[PDB]
Amino acid sequence: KQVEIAERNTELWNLIALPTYTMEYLDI
Amino acid sequence: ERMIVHRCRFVDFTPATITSLAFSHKSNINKLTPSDLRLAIGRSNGNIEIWNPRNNWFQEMVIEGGKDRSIEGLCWSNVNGESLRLFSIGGSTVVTEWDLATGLPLRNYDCNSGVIWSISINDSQDKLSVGCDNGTVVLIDISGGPGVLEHDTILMRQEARVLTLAWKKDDFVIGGCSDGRIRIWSAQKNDENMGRLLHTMKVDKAKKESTLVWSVIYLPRTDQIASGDSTGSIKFWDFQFATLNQSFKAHDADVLCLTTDTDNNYVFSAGVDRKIFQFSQNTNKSQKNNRWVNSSNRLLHGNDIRAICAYQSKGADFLVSGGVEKTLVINSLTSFSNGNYRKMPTVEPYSKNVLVNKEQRLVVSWSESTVKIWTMGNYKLVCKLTLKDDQNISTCSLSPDGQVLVVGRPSTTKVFHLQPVGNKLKVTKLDNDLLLRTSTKLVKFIDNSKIVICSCEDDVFIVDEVELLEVTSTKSSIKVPYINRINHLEVDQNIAVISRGCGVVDILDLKARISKPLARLNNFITAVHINTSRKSVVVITADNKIYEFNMNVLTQWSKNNTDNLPKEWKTLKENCVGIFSDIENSSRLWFWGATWISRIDFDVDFPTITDESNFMNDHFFFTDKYKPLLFVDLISSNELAIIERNPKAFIQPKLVF
Amino acid sequence: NILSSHLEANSTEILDDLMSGSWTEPEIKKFILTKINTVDHLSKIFLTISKSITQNPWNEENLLPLWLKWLLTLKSGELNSIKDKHTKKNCKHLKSALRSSEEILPVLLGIQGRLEMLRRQAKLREDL
Amino acid sequence: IKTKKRKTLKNLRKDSVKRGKFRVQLLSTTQDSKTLPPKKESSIIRSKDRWLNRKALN
Amino acid sequence: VAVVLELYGNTLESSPVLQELMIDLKTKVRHEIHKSKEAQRIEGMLQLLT
Amino acid sequence: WHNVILSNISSNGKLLAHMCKDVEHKSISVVSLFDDSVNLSFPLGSILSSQTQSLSYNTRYVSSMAIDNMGQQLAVGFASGVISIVSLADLQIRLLKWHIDSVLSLSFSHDGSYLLSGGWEKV
Amino acid sequence: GPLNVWVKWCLIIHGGYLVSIPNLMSTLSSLHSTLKRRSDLLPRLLALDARLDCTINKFKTLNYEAGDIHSSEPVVEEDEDDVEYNEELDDAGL
RNA sequence: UGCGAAAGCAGUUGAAGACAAGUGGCUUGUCGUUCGUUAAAAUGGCCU
C-alpha cells in the first residue's frame, strides 16, 4: 500500500479545422 | 427567433491565377490624371477583366473566354483621339484584338510565325512586336483605327524561344531570349539596317540549369536596359556600347517581371519567390554616376508574382502586382518603404456567380461552363450539369418557380425546365431558337414564364421587342466605348430598370415599353434594385452614396441620410455589389458588399487610390464576420444565407522568434 | 443521486468536505466524471483539498485525491492564472508536501526488494 | 455502366479515324470559334508552368 | 515526446493517426517502468548482500 | 548642444553626428567641426518607415551610428537589427537587413563603399 | 526480465557465500552499476507517464463525448446524382 | 529578492513625472524620466 500511494502521488506531483456547413444566429 | 444564418462553404469556385496586366494610359507625372484610366487584368482561364482605379477600384467589365484558353500577355493602344484597344494573346499563334464595346474579339490576327510568347506595343502605338517560338520577332502594323492589323516584317531569325520584348522608341526592339542572351534588333524606316540585329549581349549562365531571361525593359533617362532572368541576376546593361553597366544577384529564384516609373528613378523587380524589391537612383550624386543601388526590399505575397505594373500622375502614383495566389496587391509607388499597401479580395463579384431561390429553398451555383444546384432543409447536393456547347459562362438565372433555368453565353444561351423527383433533379432542355441566336448579358425573369434579355448590341427583348431611348456620346465614351452600354437591369411584375456604366439609369415600361430615363448620377452606377413599396428604385454608385427615386423622384430620406450616412459607410473600402429587400417590411432593405453586410431602414435618420480629377465624363445594422464573401441572400423568411469561400509555394521561412 | 446531492451542496454552501464524503458514498470514477461534467465556477475545492492533502499526504483513501487529480487533469486549462491571491503559496507548500514521495520511491523499492528477497529465501529454506 | 459512358463520349467528341488508306478530319462550326479565338497550346504552356514549378526551387 | 505532446495537444484531439502511437507509447512506458522497478529491486537486494 | 544620447565621429575626424531628443520626436544632427561646410538636422521619423511607426520600441531604438568620410552617407543601426543607411543630401533611405540581433558596431570604410559592422552574434 | 529472473535467483539461492567473500563490490561493480544506470532515471519517466496519460485521457474522454457520427455520415456527395446529369449534352445528342 | 543542498525555505508588488493615442476635459499605452522596496513579433540567421 505504501508503493501504491507513492506511485499515485508521484503521479500527482508530475501532474502539477473548418466544417463545410454550419447554422448561426445574429441580432437586430 | 432572430435571423438564423447559414455559413455555407460548399462551392469550390475560385478565379484562376492572374498572369498579366497593363495600364491604359501613359504616366506623365506633372499632368492631371486622365478620366479614362483603365487597368486590364488577364488570368490563366482567359477571363480578361478591367478595373478603374479611381473611387477605390471598382471592377466593371469582364470579357471571359471559356475552356482551354489563356492569356500570357496583353497591351493597350491609345492613339490621341481614337478608341482604346486591347491586344492580347492566347496560348497559340493569334494576336486577339478585343473590342472595348461588348466583350467580343473584333479581330483575331493569326500571326504568320511560331507560337506567340510576348507582345510589346510601340511608342506612338503604330507598330507592335510579338515574339514567336521558332525564334522570330514579328512586327505588326496597326494603323487605320480599329479592326486593322497587317504583318509588316519579321526580323532576323535565330534558334531561341523569344521570351520578352520591349521597344525603346519607334527604332530599337530589345528582346530577351531563352538561351540567356538578350538581343537588340533595329527596325526603323528609311535606314539601311532594318530587320537586322545589332548586338547579342549575354547574361551570365549556370551549369546545372538552362538560364533564360524572363523579362527586359528599357530605361530612357539613363539610357539603359534592365534585364531579369532565371538566376535572379537583375542586370543593368548600357544601351549604346551594348554592355553591362552593373549587376545584382539580389533575387533568390526566377525573376519574372519588372517595371519603372516615368523618369526612371526606380526599378521594381518581382519574381517567383515573391520578394518584390526596388532599386533606386534617387540621389543627385547617384544620377551623376547614373548607378543603381539595391535600395529597399519588401515581401508581400503568399506564393508568387507573375506580373507587375506601375503608374504615376500628379494625384496618383502606385504599383500593382499579382501572382499565382489570385489576389492583387497595390503599393504606393514613390514611397515604397513608407507606403501603406493594400490587398485586394480574391473575388469582388460585381458580375455575380451564384443565385438562390425561395421555392424549394434552393441555391444554383454556376462555375465555368458548369452549374451545380442544391437545396436546404442539413442539405443535399442535388444535381450537377456540365455543358459542352456552352464554353464561356455568364449569368444563369432561375425562375420564381423551380422550373425554368436560363443559362447565358454571349454566343448561344439555353433554357431548361426542372422536374424535382426528390433526391435528384431532372433537367429538360427546351428549344428557344430566337434566344439561342441572340446574345445575352442579363437574364432577369419578369414573370414565371416570360423573361427579358439584354443584348450585346444595346437592344432589349422579351422571350416567351422592347425600345429604349438613345444616349449622347461624350468624348470619354468615344475614348472608351463601353461607357455608353447598359450594364444592369432589374424586373419585378412588368416594371424594369436599366443602368449603363455612364451614370444614367432609365426605368422601362412593359405594358407599353417606353423608356422614361431618370439619370441622376455622376459616377459609375454599381448596384440597382427596384422597390414595389413606395414606388422607389435604389441605386448605389461606386462612391457608396446611396439614392432612391420615384417614378410616375426624391424622398427626404434620400435627401438627408445620404450625406449624413453612417460612419462605416463613410470609411468603406470594398464597394457594394448586391441589393435585396426584406421579408417583412418591404421598405427595409438588406444589402451587401463582398466584405460586409448592411441592413438599412428607410426613415431612421442620423445627425492607395486615384483622386485628382473629375468623374468618368471628361434600425441600422452592419456586420463583418463573413469576409471571404461570395453571395448572401435570403433562403426563406427568418433565415439568411451567406455563401462564403475557403481553401506548393516558395519556402520563405518565418524566423521562429 | 449522491453526485446530485453533492453538486447541490457544492452550489449551496461551504460543505465541500461533505461533498467529498458524498462522492465517497457514490464511490465511482463515473461519479467523478459526473461532477466534472457539472459546470460552474468550481473554485476553492482545490483549497479544501490542498489543506487536506498537506495535512495528510499518507492517507490510504485513494478516492478523494484520485477525484481531485482527475479534476486537475481534466480542468487543467481553465484554472491556471484565474486565481493568484493565496494560490501561489498554496500550491507551493502542496508541492513541498509532495516532494517527499519522489525522494523516497527508490528507497521504498529497495525495502520492497529486501522484503521479497527475505520472503522467498525463507520460503526456499523449507526443510524438506 | 462503368466505362461505356466515357467511351461513347470519346467516340462522339473525337475527330474521325483512317478509313481504307487515308484519313478524314472534320471541320467545326464557324459560329463556335468566333468569340474566343485560339486554343491554348498545351505542349508549351505546360513547359512554362513546369519551369515555374521546377524541382530546383521548392 | 513530452515537449511534442505539450505543443501538439489540439492536433492530438483532431487527428486519429498518432493516437495509437500515444497508446502503445503508454504501454512502452508501463513496460519500461516495470523493468526499471524490478531492476531497482535487484539494486536493493545487492545493497542487502553488501 | 544640450541633450545627446548617441554621437559618433567620422573616421578621419572632419565630421561628427549626434542626437538631440528634441520634441517633435528624437532628432539627428550632423555637424562639421573644423569648417562649416556641412551642418544639418532632421527628426528621425523621416528616417523611420511606417513599418516601424506603430510596432515595438526595439525597432524605433537607434542602437549605433556612423558617418562616411565625405559627409553624404549616414548609417543608423537599430536594436532589432536593421541598418538604415540614409543619404545626407535628400534624406532618403536604404535597408541593409541581415543582423538578427542588435547592431553594436558599424563604420564606413575610407571611401564610402564598404559598411563594416558587427553585432551580438560573433560575426 | 527473462534473465533478470536468472540474475536474481543466483542471489536468492546463494547469498551467504558471496557475503562472506571479502571483496563484493570490487568484482560485482559492473552489475550494480548497470542496474543503477537502469534505475536512476525513474522520476522523469514518471513525468513522461503523467503528461502522456493526461493528454491521451483528455483526448479519449473528449472523443468519447463527441464521437456521435460512427454509423453513417459524409452524405450530399454522390456519383449517382452526377450520373449522366454531369454529361447533360451527351444525353442531349445521343 | 535573501538563505540553503543540487530540494526548498521566508518575503516583493509601489509613488510621482513626461509623451503619445482615442473619445475643452476624460479613458488606454510607452519611458536611453525621478524616488523608494534586499525584490517574441522589420523575411534577417556564421565566408573562401
What is the β-pairing status of strands B4-8 and B639-643? parallel
Q: Do F90 and B284 touch (CB under 8 A)?
A: yes
Q: What residues in G contact A10, CB-CB < 8 Å?
A: 43, 46
**Distance, first Cα to last Cα, chain G:** 76
Interatomic CA distance for residues B506 and B348, integer angstroms = 25
Q: Between β-strands B404-407 and B396-398, what pairing exists: parallel, antiparallel or unpaired?
A: antiparallel
List CB contacts of C25: < 8 A, sequence separation 6 or more.
C2
Cell of A20: 463545410
* Contact partners, residue C82, CB within 8 Å, separation at least 6: C43
Q: How far apart are the C-alpha atoms of B382 and G77, rounded to whole Å?
A: 9
Residues 6+ apart with CB under 8 A from C65: A8, A9, A12, C49, C53
Q: CB under 8 Å, gap of 24 or more: what pairs does F48-56 form?
A: F49/B337, F49/B338, F49/F93, F50/B338, F50/B339, F50/B340, F51/B337, F52/F78, F56/F80
Helix (H, G, I), strand (E, B) or coil at C110: helix
Q: Which residues of G touch C76 (CB under 8 A)?
A: 54, 58
Partners of residue G54 in chain A, C-beta under 8 Å: 15
Resolution as reported, in Å: 4.0
Burial class (CB in 10 A: 0-12, 13-18, 19+), B542: buried
C-alpha cell at B265: 528613378
Residue B376 grid coordinates: 436546404
Which set of grid coordinates corresponds to residue B479?
475614348
Radius of gyration of chain C (CA): 20
After which residues does chain A break, using C–N > 2.5 Å?
A: 16
- Residue among E12, E22, E36 whose CB faces G42 most closely: E36
By the 8 A CB rule, do C107 and G42 touch? no
Q: Are B594 and B311 in contact (CB under 8 A)?
A: no
Residue of G nearest to D5 (CA): G84
In total, chain C counts a number of residues equal to 128
Alpha-carbon gap, residue G53 to E23, rounded angstroms: 9
Amino acid identity for residue A2 in this structure: Q
The CA distance from F61 to F26, in Å, is 10
Instruction: Evaluate whether B491 touches B452 at the Cβ level (below 8 Å).
Output: yes
CA distance B491 to B443: 10
Which residues, at least 6 apart from F23, have a Cβ–Cβ distance to it below 8 Å? none
For residues B55 and B503, what is the distance between their CA atoms, to the nearest angstrom? 14
Q: Which residues of chain D does G80 touch, with a Cβ-Cβ cutoff of 8 Å? A: none
Burial track B205-232 (b if 16+ CB lie within 10 A, e otherwise): beeeeebbbbbbbbbeebebbbbbbbbb
The amino acid that residue B474 corresponds to is T
Contact B560, B543 (CB under 8 A): no
CB contact under 8 A, F49 and B283: no
Q: What share of chain A is helix, strand, coil (3-state, %, to 5)?
A: 50, 20, 30
Q: Pick the closest to residue B633 from B476, B398, B416, B470 (CA basis).
A: B398
Half-sphere exposure of B142 (CA within 13 A, CB side): 33
CA B34 remoteness from chain centre: 19
Q: Nearest chain F Cα to B657, which residue?
A: F100
Residues contacting residue D24 through CB under 8 Å, at least 6 positions apart: D16, D18
From the CA of F75 to the C1' of H23: give the distance in Å.
40
User: Beta-strand (E) ranges in B111-220?
Assistant: 118-121, 127-131, 137-141, 150-154, 162-167, 172-177, 181-186, 197-202, 215-219
Largest CA distance in chain A: 64
Query: How many CA atoms does the CB half-sphere of B314 hold within 13 Å?
Result: 6
Which chains are adjacent to chain D, needing at least 3 Cβ pairs under 8 Å? B, G
B near G: at least 3 beta-carbon pairs less than 8 Å apart: yes
DSSP G38: H
Cell of B414: 439555353
Chains F and C are touching, with contact defined as 3 or more CB–CB pairs separated by less than 8 Å: no
SS3 labels along B543-581 = CCCEEEEECCCCCHHHHHCCCCCCHHHHCCCCCEEECCE
Chains meeting B at 3+ CB pairs closer than 8 A?
A, D, F, G
Three-class secondary structure assignment of D1-58: CCCHHHHHHHHHHCCCCCECCECCCCCCCCCCCCCCCCCCCHHHHHHHHHHHCCCCCC
As to burial, measured by CB atoms within 10 angstroms (0-12 exposed, 13-18 middle, 19+ buried), residue B322 is: buried
Only one residue has cell 501561489, namely C88
> Which are the contacts of F74, defined by CB distance < 8 A and separation ≥ 6?
F17, F28, F30, F65, F66, F67, F68, F85, F86, F87, F88
Return the closest-CA partner of residue G82 out of D5, B416, B12, B357.
D5
Q: Which candidate from F49, F72, F90 shows the least CB-CB separation from B337?
A: F49
Closest CA to B214 of B306, B295, B148: B306
3-state secondary structure of B351: coil
Residue-wise over C78-104: b if at least 16 C-beta within 10 A, else e? eeeeeeeeebeebeeebeebbeebbee
**What is the per-residue burial (b if ≥16 Cβ within 10 Å, else e) of B491-504?**
bbeebbbbbbbbbb
Q: Which residues of C touch A15 (CB under 8 A)?
A: 69, 72-73
Burial F85-119 (b: 16+ CB within 10 A, else e): bbbbeeebbbbbeebeebbeebbbeeeeeebebeb
Scanning the structure block, which residue is given the C-alpha cell 549581349?
Answer: B201
Q: Minimal Cα distance from A12: which residue of C?
A: C69
Distance CA B243, CA B445 (A): 66
| Distance from C-alpha of B91 to C-alpha of D42, rounded to nearest angstrom | 8
Tell me the CA distances in angstroms from B68 to B240, D36, D45, one per residue in order: 43, 10, 11
H-state helical runs in E1-50: 2-7, 9-14, 19-49
**What is the rounded CA–CA span in Å between residue B238 and residue B226?**
9
Give the residue among B211, B116, B352 at the shortest CA–CA distance from D54: B211
Method used experimentally: cryo-EM
DSSP 3-state of F62? strand
Distance of alpha carbon B142 from alpha carbon E40, whole angstroms: 94
Q: Which residue of F has its CA nearest to B294?
A: F94
Establish if A21 touches chain B: CB-CB under 8 angstroms.
yes
The helix (run of H) or strand (run of E) holding residue G32 is helix G31-39
**Helical packing angle, C16-24 and C63-74, nearest 10°:** 110
Q: Output the CA–CA distances (angstroms, integers) from residue F33 to F15, F30, F38, F39, in the order listed.
A: 6, 10, 9, 9
C-alpha–C-alpha distance, residues B516 and B537, integer Å: 14
Provide the shortest C-alpha distance from residue G24 to chain B (in Å): 55
B33 near B612, Cβ under 8 Å?
yes
Name the nucleotide nearest B296; use CA and C1'.
H42
